[PDB]
Scaffold this active site. Structure first.
Site, PDB file in Angstrom:
ATOM      1  CB  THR B  92      -0.992  -0.009   1.166  1.00  0.00           C
ATOM      2  OG1 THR B  92      -1.917  -1.074   0.967  1.00  0.00           O
ATOM      3  CG2 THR B  92      -1.803   1.203   1.161  1.00  0.00           C
ATOM      4  CE  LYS B 167      -5.258  -0.597   1.896  1.00  0.00           C
ATOM      5  NZ  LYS B 167      -4.189  -1.594   2.209  1.00  0.00           N
ATOM      6  CE  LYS B 242       2.364   1.861   5.164  1.00  0.00           C
ATOM      7  NZ  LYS B 242       2.141   1.332   3.783  1.00  0.00           N
TER       8      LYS B 242
HETATM    9  N1  LIG Z   1      -0.592  -6.020   8.183  1.00  0.00           N
HETATM   10  C1  LIG Z   1      -1.757  -5.610   7.682  1.00  0.00           C
HETATM   11  O1  LIG Z   1      -2.765  -5.663   8.357  1.00  0.00           O
HETATM   12  C2  LIG Z   1      -1.886  -5.070   6.281  1.00  0.00           C
HETATM   13  C3  LIG Z   1      -3.095  -5.167   5.582  1.00  0.00           C
HETATM   14  C4  LIG Z   1      -3.192  -4.661   4.287  1.00  0.00           C
HETATM   15  C5  LIG Z   1      -2.079  -4.069   3.698  1.00  0.00           C
HETATM   16  N2  LIG Z   1      -0.916  -3.962   4.367  1.00  0.00           N
HETATM   17  C6  LIG Z   1       0.227  -3.326   3.690  1.00  0.00           C
HETATM   18  O2  LIG Z   1       1.143  -4.326   3.227  1.00  0.00           O
HETATM   19  C7  LIG Z   1       2.489  -3.864   3.299  1.00  0.00           C
HETATM   20  C8  LIG Z   1       3.325  -4.806   4.171  1.00  0.00           C
HETATM   21  O3  LIG Z   1       2.537  -5.340   5.240  1.00  0.00           O
HETATM   22  P1  LIG Z   1       3.140  -6.312   6.374  1.00  0.00           P
HETATM   23  O4  LIG Z   1       2.168  -6.335   7.526  1.00  0.00           O
HETATM   24  O5  LIG Z   1       3.554  -7.597   5.686  1.00  0.00           O
HETATM   25  O6  LIG Z   1       4.466  -5.518   6.860  1.00  0.00           O
HETATM   26  P2  LIG Z   1       5.747  -6.206   7.562  1.00  0.00           P
HETATM   27  O7  LIG Z   1       6.640  -5.101   8.054  1.00  0.00           O
HETATM   28  O8  LIG Z   1       5.253  -7.286   8.499  1.00  0.00           O
HETATM   29  O9  LIG Z   1       6.452  -6.943   6.335  1.00  0.00           O
HETATM   30  C9  LIG Z   1       7.222  -6.284   5.327  1.00  0.00           C
HETATM   31  C10 LIG Z   1       8.440  -7.144   5.043  1.00  0.00           C
HETATM   32  O10 LIG Z   1       9.166  -6.649   3.927  1.00  0.00           O
HETATM   33  C11 LIG Z   1      10.559  -6.819   4.207  1.00  0.00           C
HETATM   34  N3  LIG Z   1      11.430  -5.994   3.311  1.00  0.00           N
HETATM   35  C12 LIG Z   1      11.939  -4.766   3.522  1.00  0.00           C
HETATM   36  N4  LIG Z   1      12.681  -4.378   2.452  1.00  0.00           N
HETATM   37  C13 LIG Z   1      12.651  -5.368   1.536  1.00  0.00           C
HETATM   38  C14 LIG Z   1      13.213  -5.623   0.181  1.00  0.00           C
HETATM   39  N5  LIG Z   1      13.987  -4.694  -0.440  1.00  0.00           N
HETATM   40  N6  LIG Z   1      12.923  -6.803  -0.423  1.00  0.00           N
HETATM   41  C15 LIG Z   1      12.151  -7.738   0.171  1.00  0.00           C
HETATM   42  N7  LIG Z   1      11.607  -7.565   1.398  1.00  0.00           N
HETATM   43  C16 LIG Z   1      11.820  -6.431   2.111  1.00  0.00           C
HETATM   44  C17 LIG Z   1      10.693  -6.571   5.706  1.00  0.00           C
HETATM   45  O11 LIG Z   1      11.867  -7.180   6.266  1.00  0.00           O
HETATM   46  C18 LIG Z   1       9.407  -7.181   6.227  1.00  0.00           C
HETATM   47  O12 LIG Z   1       9.608  -8.537   6.669  1.00  0.00           O
HETATM   48  C19 LIG Z   1       2.422  -2.425   3.839  1.00  0.00           C
HETATM   49  O13 LIG Z   1       2.568  -1.489   2.765  1.00  0.00           O
HETATM   50  C20 LIG Z   1       1.054  -2.326   4.512  1.00  0.00           C
HETATM   51  O14 LIG Z   1       0.506  -1.004   4.474  1.00  0.00           O
HETATM   52  C21 LIG Z   1      -0.801  -4.451   5.624  1.00  0.00           C
END
Ligand SMILES: NC(=O)c1ccc[n+]([C@@H]2O[C@H](COP(=O)([O-])OP(=O)(O)OC[C@H]3O[C@@H](n4cnc5c(N)ncnc54)[C@H](O)[C@@H]3O)[C@@H](O)[C@H]2O)c1
Ligand SMILES: NC(=O)c1ccc[n+]([C@@H]2O[C@H](COP(=O)([O-])OP(=O)(O)OC[C@H]3O[C@@H](n4cnc5c(N)ncnc54)[C@H](O)[C@@H]3O)[C@@H](O)[C@H]2O)c1
Ligand SMILES: C[C@@H](CCC(=O)O)C(=O)O
Lengths: 291, 290
Positions: B92, B167, B242
Site C-alpha cells: 500500500t 483503497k 498509515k
Molecule cells: N498487516 C496488515 O494488516 C496489512 C493489511 C493490508 C495491507 N498492508 C500493507 O502491506 C504492506 C506490508 O505489510 P506487512 O504487515 O507484511 O508488513 P511487515 O513489516 O510485516 O512486512 C514487510 C516485510 O518486507 C521486508 N522488506 C523490507 N525491504 C525489503 C526488500 N527490499 N525486499 C524484500 N523484502 C523487504 C521486511 O523485512 C518485512 O519482513 C504495507 O505497505 C502495509 O501497508 C498491511
C-alpha cells in the site's frame, strides 16, 4: 370512525400525515394558522377549526407537527388546559432533546400522556405512509398510540424515555451529514487522482465505506440515476433541513458537554452551505470541494 | 507458474503459503531471518538476495512497507527479470509512487499491476483478501490464476494507480465513519439514550455502516466487535494512521479539499501516539483529548 385525532400543523408533513389518518377512518380535527395549509387539509377530509383549543377540545389524541421547539412550547401552553384529562399528545416535530423533555414534563403536569415521535422519510414518506417513527416515552403509552401511528408509518421504533426519539434521530442525522461530506470528499479526490466515479462507487459500495450517502444518495451523476445528483440536486433531503437537524445536534452537544469534532465540523460546513444553497439537496455540499 | 515473492512479513508470509498450497513454485526473499525462516517452513525457497529470487520467475510479487522501498526493489531486480515478467505490487503506497514503479516496470518490457489488499493478517491466512487492481485488463486476466488462491474478492479499479486510489479513498471514508459513529455513541450516552437503542435505530436507518454494524465501538450490541475484547485488532490504529497519511499525501499532491478526511487524519495521528496497538474503533476513548 375509531379515534378522534386533533392535528396541529398541517404543513408539508402534517397535511399528507393527516390525510392518511382520514383514509384509515379516523375523525381528524385540524388546526393551522396558515390558511392555505388548513384549506389543503380540509380538501382531504380534515375538520378545520377556528383555534387550536377548539381542535383539541373533543380529541382522544393530539398530534403536533410544528417547525420548532419554541412553537411546540407555545402550542402546548395554549392548548393543554383545553384538552380533556388523560388525552394522548404526540409530538412528531423535530425539536431539541432539551425542549422535548420540557414539553413532555409540561404535558404530564397538565395530566396528559405525551410521546416524542419525530420522523424520517420526508414528504414522500409522509404521503406513502412509510415514515420511520422514532418514539420516546412510556412503553404503555406507545402501545396505546400504535393504532394512530400505524396508518402513517412504515416503521415504529421505541428508543427509550422521553426525548429518546429526538436523541436517536439527531445522532443518526449527525452521522449522515458527516458521511455525506466524507463521501463527497472521496469522489472529488478520486476525480483528481484519475479514478473514475463508477469505479469508486463499485469499490466503496462493495467495501467498508458503504452507506446510504453513496448507495442511494450518490453525489456525482451516473452511478445511481435516481439520486439527486442526476436531477440538478432537487431535494430529496434539503440543505435547509439538514442544517436545522445539525443545529439541534449542536444544541444536544452543547447541553451535554459532549465532544463531537467531525459532527461539529459538518455543522459548520452545512451552516455556510445553507446560506447560499438552502434549497438544494444536502448531497450538493460536494460543490464546495471543487475549485 | 513460478512466483518470486519479495517481502515475507505479516502479510507476505501467509499469502506466499497460500500460493505454495495452490501448486505454484514460490521463490522468496526477506532481509529478516525470522521472516525468511518461517517462509521456508511452509515451502518457499528463500534466496540470499532479491535479484536471485526474481531470476527464474514468471511473476514477481512485492509486499513491502513503503514506496521508497518498492521503487528501490524494482531497480535492484528489473534487469535480473526475464522479458514479459508479470509484476504485481500489493504494497500500500501512494498513487504517485504506484504509477512511477508501473512506468519503470513497463519500460523494461514487463507487465505491471498495482493490487493492494484489504483484510489484514486474518484475511491473508484465510485467503479472503480483497484485491483492488490498477493496470490493463489483459494484464489482470493473466494475473487472475495467481491472485485467486490468495483472494476472496478481485476488483479491477482502472488504469495503473486506480487500485491504490480506490483503497485510500475508501479507508479515508472509513476513518471518518468510525469517529462519527464514536461521537454518536457518547452523545447518546450523555443524552440518556442506551447504546442498544442507538444501535437498533442507526443500523435500520441512513447512518448505517460497517463502522457500527460490524465494528460497534461500545460493547454489547455486536459481541464480536473489538470493544467487547479490550479493543484487540481487528484493524489497528497504527495501520489506519498509515493509510490516512497516504490519503493526506494524495490530497497534498492533487490540491484537493478534504476537511473531514483531514480532520480524521489529525485525530488518528495523535491517537496513534498512544494507542497504535489498539483497534481503530478505540478512537471513542480519545475524544475528550480535543
Ligand atoms: N498487516 C496488515 O494488516 C496489512 C493489511 C493490508 C495491507 N498492508 C500493507 O502491506 C504492506 C506490508 O505489510 P506487512 O504487515 O507484511 O508488513 P511487515 O513489516 O510485516 O512486512 C514487510 C516485510 O518486507 C521486508 N522488506 C523490507 N525491504 C525489503 C526488500 N527490499 N525486499 C524484500 N523484502 C523487504 C521486511 O523485512 C518485512 O519482513 C504495507 O505497505 C502495509 O501497508 C498491511
Ligand atoms: N419536510 C421534511 O422533509 C421533513 C422531514 C422530517 C422531519 N421534518 C420535520 O417536521 C416538522 C414539520 O415539517 P413541515 O415541512 O411540515 O414544516 P412546515 O413549516 O411545512 O409546517 C409547519 C406548520 O405548522 C404551522 N403552525 C405554526 N404554529 C402553529 C400552531 N400553534 N398550531 C398549529 N399549527 C401551527 C405552520 O403554519 C405550518 O403550516 C419540522 O419540525 C421538521 O423538522 C420535516
Ligand atoms: C477473487 C476470486 C477467487 C475467490 C477465491 O479463490 O475464493 C473470485 O471471487 O472470483
Amino acid at each position: 370512525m375509531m379515534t378522534t385525532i386533533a392535528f396541529l400543523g398541517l404543513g408539508n408533513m402534517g397535511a399528507p400525515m393527516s390525510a392518511n389518518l382520514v383514509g384509515a377512518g379516523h375523525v381528524v380535527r385540524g388546526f393551522d394558522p396558515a390558511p392555505t395549509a388548513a384549506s389543503g387539509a380540509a380538501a382531504h377530509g380534515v375538520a378545520v377549526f377556528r383555534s387550536a383549543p377548539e381542535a383539541v377540545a373533543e380529541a382522544d389524541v393530539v398530534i403536533t407537527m410544528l417547525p420548532t421547539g419554541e412553537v411546540v412550547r407555545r402550542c402546548y401552553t395554549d392548548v393543554l388546559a383545553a384538552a380533556r384529562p388523560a388525552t394522548l399528545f404526540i409530538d412528531s416535530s423535530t425539536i431539541s432533546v432539551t425542549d422535548a423533555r420540557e414539553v413532555h414534563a409540561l404535558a404530564e403536569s397538565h395530566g396528559m400522556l405525551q410521546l416524542d415521535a419525530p420522523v424520517s422519510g420526508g414528504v414522500k414518506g409522509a404521503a406513502a405512509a412509510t415514515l420511520a417513527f422514532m418514539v420516546g416515552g412510556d412503553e404503555s403509552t406507545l402501545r396505546r398510540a400504535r393504532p394512530v401511528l400505524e396508518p402513517m408509518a412504515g416503521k415504529i421504533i421505541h428508543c427509550g424515555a422521553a426525548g429518546a426519539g429526538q436523541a436517536a434521530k439527531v445522532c443518526n442525522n449527525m452521522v449522515l451529514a458527516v458521511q455525506q461530506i466524507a463521501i463527497a470528499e472521496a469522489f472529488v479526490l478520486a476525480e483528481k487522482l484519475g479514478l473514475s466515479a463508477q469505479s469508486l462507487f463499485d469499490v466503496i459500495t462493495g467495501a467498508t465505506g458503504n452507506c446510504w450517502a453513496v448507495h442511494t444518495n450518490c453525489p456525482v451523476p451516473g452511478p445511481v440515476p435516481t439520486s439527486p445528483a442526476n436531477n440538478d440536486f432537487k431535494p430529496g433531503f434539503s440543505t435547509a433541513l439538514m442544517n436545522k437537524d445539525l443545529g439541534l445536534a449542536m444544541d444536544a452537544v452543547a447541553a451535554t458537554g459532549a465532544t463531537a469534532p467531525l459532527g461539529s465540523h459538518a455543522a459548520d460546513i452545512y451552516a455556510k452551505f445553507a446560506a447560499d444553497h438552502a434549497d438544494l439537496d444536502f448531497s450538493a455540499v460536494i460543490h464546495t470541494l471543487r475549485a
